[PDB]
Design a protein around this nucleic acid. Sequence first.
RNA 1: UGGAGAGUUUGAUCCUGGCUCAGGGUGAACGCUGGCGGCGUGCCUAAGACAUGCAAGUCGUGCGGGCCGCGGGGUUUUACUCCGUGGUCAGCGGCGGACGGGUGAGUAACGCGUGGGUGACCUACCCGGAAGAGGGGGACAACCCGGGGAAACUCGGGCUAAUCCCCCAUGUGGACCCGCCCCUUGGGGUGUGUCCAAAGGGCUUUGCCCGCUUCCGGAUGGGCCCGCGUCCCAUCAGCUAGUUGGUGGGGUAAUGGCCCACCAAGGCGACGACGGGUAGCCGGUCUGAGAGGAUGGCCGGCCACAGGGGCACUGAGACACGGGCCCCACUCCUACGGGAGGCAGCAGUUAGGAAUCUUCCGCAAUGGGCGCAAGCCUGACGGAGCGACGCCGCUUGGAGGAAGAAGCCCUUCGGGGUGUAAACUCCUGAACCCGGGACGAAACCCCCGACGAGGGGACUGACGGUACCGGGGUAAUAGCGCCGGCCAACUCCGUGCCAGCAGCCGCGGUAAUACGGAGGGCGCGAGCGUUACCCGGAUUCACUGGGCGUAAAGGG
Lengths: 99, 666, 208
Amino acid sequence: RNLSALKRHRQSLKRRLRNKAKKSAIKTLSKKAIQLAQEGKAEEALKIMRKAESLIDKAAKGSTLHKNAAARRKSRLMRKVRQLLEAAGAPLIGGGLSA
Amino acid sequence: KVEYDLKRLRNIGIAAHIDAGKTTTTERILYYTGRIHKIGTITAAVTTCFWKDHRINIIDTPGHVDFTIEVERSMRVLDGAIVVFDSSQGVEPQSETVWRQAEKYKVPRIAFANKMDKTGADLWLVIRTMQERLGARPVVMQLPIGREDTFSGIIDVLRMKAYTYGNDLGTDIREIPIPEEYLDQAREYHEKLVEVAADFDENIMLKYLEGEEPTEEELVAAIRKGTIDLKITPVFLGSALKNKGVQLLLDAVVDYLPSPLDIPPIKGTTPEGEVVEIHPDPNGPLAALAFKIMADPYVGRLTFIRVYSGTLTSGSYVYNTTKGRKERVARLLRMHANHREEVEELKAGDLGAVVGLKETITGDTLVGEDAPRVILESIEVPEPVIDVAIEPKTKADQEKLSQALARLAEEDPTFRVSTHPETGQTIISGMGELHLEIIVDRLKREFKVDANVGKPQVAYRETITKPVDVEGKFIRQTGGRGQYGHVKIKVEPLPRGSGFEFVNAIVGGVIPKEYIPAVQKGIEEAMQSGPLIGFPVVDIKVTLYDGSYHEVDSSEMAFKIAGSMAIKEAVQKGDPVILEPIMRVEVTTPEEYMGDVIGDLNARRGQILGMEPRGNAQVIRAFVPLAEMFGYATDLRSKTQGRGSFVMFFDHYQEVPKQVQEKLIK
Amino acid sequence: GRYIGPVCRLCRREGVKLYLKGERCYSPKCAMERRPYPPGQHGQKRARRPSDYAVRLREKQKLRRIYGISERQFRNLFEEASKKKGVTGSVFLGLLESRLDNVVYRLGFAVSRRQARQLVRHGHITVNGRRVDLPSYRVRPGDEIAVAEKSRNLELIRQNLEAMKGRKVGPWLSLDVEGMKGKFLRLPDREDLALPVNEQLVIEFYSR
RNA sequence: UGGAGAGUUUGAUCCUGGCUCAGGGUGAACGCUGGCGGCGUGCCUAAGACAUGCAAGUCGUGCGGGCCGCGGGGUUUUACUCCGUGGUCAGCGGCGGACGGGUGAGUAACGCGUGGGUGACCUACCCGGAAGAGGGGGACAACCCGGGGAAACUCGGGCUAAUCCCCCAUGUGGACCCGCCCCUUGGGGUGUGUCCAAAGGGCUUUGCCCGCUUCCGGAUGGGCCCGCGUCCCAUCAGCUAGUUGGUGGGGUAAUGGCCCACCAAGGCGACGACGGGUAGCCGGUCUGAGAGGAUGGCCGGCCACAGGGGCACUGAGACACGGGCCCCACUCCUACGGGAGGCAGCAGUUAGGAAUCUUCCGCAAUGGGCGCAAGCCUGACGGAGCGACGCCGCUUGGAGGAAGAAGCCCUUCGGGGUGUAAACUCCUGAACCCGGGACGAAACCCCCGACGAGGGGACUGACGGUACCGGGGUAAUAGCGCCGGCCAACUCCGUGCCAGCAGCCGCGGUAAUACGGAGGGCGCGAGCGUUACCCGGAUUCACUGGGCGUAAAGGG
Ligand SMILES: CC(=O)O[C@H]1C[C@@]2(C)[C@@H](C[C@@H](O)[C@H]3[C@@]4(C)CC[C@@H](O)[C@@H](C)[C@@H]4CC[C@@]32C)/C1=C(\CCC=C(C)C)C(=O)O
Ligand SMILES: Nc1nc2c(ncn2[C@@H]2O[C@H](COP(=O)(O)OP(=O)(O)O)[C@@H](O)[C@H]2O)c(=O)[nH]1
């Protein structure tokens, strides 16, 4: 009548539910960063972005993200942020963005 | 690991005239033999149930109701049978029948008195009938404590113990000794019993005379050895609804009811022609009969079969000799009271259903796929008795109907469909009102076909009284292919049932040789649509005694018309008379009912012809008009409550009462 | 199955004598020896000239009747020789000739092909060891046709094997009456087979 | 190494030209016959609906428990039942359920075929190479207790294990932005900054086995693009708004209007757009001298779809055939409060139809998943079954035997035929018997070795007591078509334009090789005939290979 493969569904649900979160985590955070960066908060933006970054490659370990999933995100994050901090700010603190 | 000794097998049938308790009786039997309940619907013809290390097959269905036929079929296969009787229905006119059509075949059967709780429930009354009507030799086997409303327990004479039933849900039973009074009543019947069994076992006779009492084991042997011969019929009892007398009648089963082996062999025929017994040896050729096909949702087409010889195996190969067809039996199967026990083979004497087979319809004899290709008996011949006109409304429905019987004829070969070979309308051959009636529901519902239900027509005939002679001229002479034909004939009426006679009354040959054939095909022809209604003008002699011709004008055709004219008018002129069909019918009826029976027949445009007795009954013969002869079934069984039967044959045609001449002018 | 039924009939018809029987046809009575003419009721009458078709048919039926062999089989082997590399005419005979049931008769183990085939069937024959029972077996060049052992001393074998001391066998065959042997030297050849049959016709016949 | 024609317009002729026939081929069906066996092949119609069973699982060498059989019993006897291990039950976690198998509905299209491009990418498992595996926290099932239930199950507390999750570390080294270098669509470097590793089991226990982590390569499989090739209809002629391009964003493994926003008016079409029908494409198949025509069953490749539609989740992979969510349709149980579903898997049921099979045996082999293994699962597959459905082989007898029985048929009554046919005579002996009886199966495992080579050793057959072999061994199924010409094969009797035949031309109207029977004959033979469909014949769409004064055909 039935098959124990829903075991797979039960999981299907867990995992989704997991990464669902670190997913939306980095999301919001990704934003809080670039927000500042643009707003002018030179270093305190760099800060957050330094964090976001981690949380990303961090997520990339598992199955949430992967391949360039992360690296793409980054090449945009610490792309635009430096592309908003040039709105007259001079990269303050030694956040991720390299000299 | 035997579980099949055969002498442990009980194939039985529940028969009886309606009302009774047949059906309800069965489901009950199927709750006792299988209440089981351990800390571990007649769902298809025959079913198995176990009662004290004995496997029983039951096939409740009888009904009596008009159409027996089927009853008389299971009957042929089964070995024993319980003729349920309704205690209550005591001025019982229909307790009969059922049986008198049992000994008909030759099978043993015990009695059961079902409603010993319902009003008029008077045991004896029945016996004052079961020997007065049919007249068997029953033997009282029980005496109920509390007639009808006061239904409590029972006593078995043979075994002189008293039982009780404290309720009717089927729980609080018990074997409580005889209650004060009654007792005495017993004795005597318990002596007669033994006295009755004396007529079988001499042993139980001399010991009767000496003063010694017969052993409960030799006493049984008597009773049993007496039933089996169709001499005696053990009568028992109990409200089947109150769950009473059953668990005890269940014993009554085995203890007296025949085992496949006490049964007399079926005869079968070689492909050449010669009888021969078919031995119930589960090791001889494989011969099994079939008896009932059924469409299952779950497994599909099912062929319930009664094995006689050899032993079928699940997933083998058979051979229906009947329709010389090589079937591949795939699956074997036994019907348990609530599930489908898939067995692996069926040894001679046993019953169940096989799945597979497509060409095996009813009554088909199945042997082994190499065995001597033999065919059993089975040949029963119960034709129909009541039919009706069915015109399938607009030609649309006329089709749904075609399928209607194209599947309904296979799903019930107790009928026949006939399209009046002269005039569209189709008859529905039945065997009793109800019969055809319930088909009118299925055939009209499950087929959604919606048509008309009148009665057949009658094959009337045209002729005349006075003989006449008219001219047959034709001629059309205008300018070339003249068309010149003329003849004169002599028309003369003939005895109803004379036929067709013409007369080459032409001398030298005033009417050239080449044309006569043509003047006959013309005359012959015309005689088709009567001068009155348009019916076969017949019973006449025609005399061509004159007529001329033209050398050039005449035509093979010109003559055919001229002759078709003399005919088309001599009838008109010699005063036409609407002949109709008369039948020969013979009603077998107990001169009891006869009185009115004859009446009825007289008030039916018919005139009596005699009555030379038959059986214990009496036959009456006479003629009748098919018109006032329709649905005679439900009229003969009226004047006779069932005890009536008739036949019918055509014989001649004959003139209508004139008042019925202008009747037909429509 | 290989026909069965009146033979020294066909002997006739084709009007070109055949030894379907073997011995007897030799005697004054191959049928055609007595009444050399197509059978039936009519038979002996001035015959209308045959058509272009009738002709080739009869040459086929002749060639095929000789080897006694189902048109089916007959056709297959032709439809084989054609595509086969080599002058088709010859070729066709070539295989036809390599039938075991034939090689047997040729070898003289059997008075008639009718007979030879039965022998073949009943394993009275052997090839290089393993007996064969398929008349249709096709002999390659360089095989020993011998009589089985259980057989060897069975009347028939002898009498026929007997008249063999003397009688020749095809330049393509070498026989040893003692050991009841016989090799298939080479693929028989056009002339080697002296037949009252014309292959060209027949071919033309399978060209329509 | 390859090409056949013939019947039919007339009084006669020649031409043109239609019609017709013989040939092959079939997943076939139908008729009348029907003996054996091998290898094939068997829903072509309703992608209509479907009872039942089985078609996907497996690891205890990842982890904690419940129950049950063993050790030793905890206590003084069973008690609060602990302990080490092997079954089990489900729960965890690990892989596998995306392969395999089915089907042709859709689709005229980068779907397919082919041949290429990825400075536009991905690849679990498997090889090779390099470096590692350092610390801490942390919950949820299982379980207990408790509630609601007919049922499916469901809700609430509280524990706890791990190769489950999570933080910090170290980073061989990898990811990003910036600068420079080579390069040339995003490819390789290189420095600053910044960010990220990990898991533990078994044993014989600092050493192996199996795992883990990161990075580089190998391999295999893919994603995507592009040129060319891929049907009928102009009595479908114009089509287009995310429409064509652009910038920036999103999105992805990755390119891209794949999406969003905004700008620009562009993009396509008689080289046939758009619209409408039909169809899965190819290897191949049949036919054909060839070109060419048809075709696409089984087998192999690719695609698509799994009731119809929409959607995402998990994941290396899927928008998932036996997963999930919503709409809709159908199917079922119901204590009617609410549950359970999808045979185009294997087999079968029903309906439809002219028609297409067994709810079969075996995991013996091959092949697949999980496991260190033993081993488990495997309707994949290997076999059996029914069917002249096809093909191939074989048999119903062989040799004698009359100027030639009989019967029957024809007769000019002389006789002619059936016909060596029978008879009769010998001889071989299918079937069928007793007996014997496989190959497919040698590894995984285990032992020497070094758990490498190599050597030895053990357990392994569904078919199957089948094939096949030796001994015995009886004369042991024939049909069907046709007999005017094309076309081989002719007489008698019936019949009288009747009944009937018939592909064509045409037969039948009292002496018919054309109807119907008989005798006889011809062809073929477990088959013979018919009916569908495709090629051929048909140079009758002509490239090969045709034509237009009057035959059809020159446009005023
Ligand atoms: C269950 C059984 O054994 O009999 C049942 C079933 C029954 C024998 C039925 C009577 C009659 O239809 C029978 C026929 C021939 C009716 C016609 C078809 O439909 C047949 C396929 C069917 C077979 C059995 C059936 C259907 C019964 C009756 C019917 C009585 C009717 C009334 C109005 C009381 C009965 O027994 O009373
Ligand atoms: N009261 C009562 N009724 C009974 C009993 N047996 C049968 N019946 C009634 O008989 C009637 C018909 O029953 P059934 O067995 O179907 O009749 P059958 O089919 O003609 O035998 C129903 O009304 C039942 O209630 C009984 O023992 N007691």
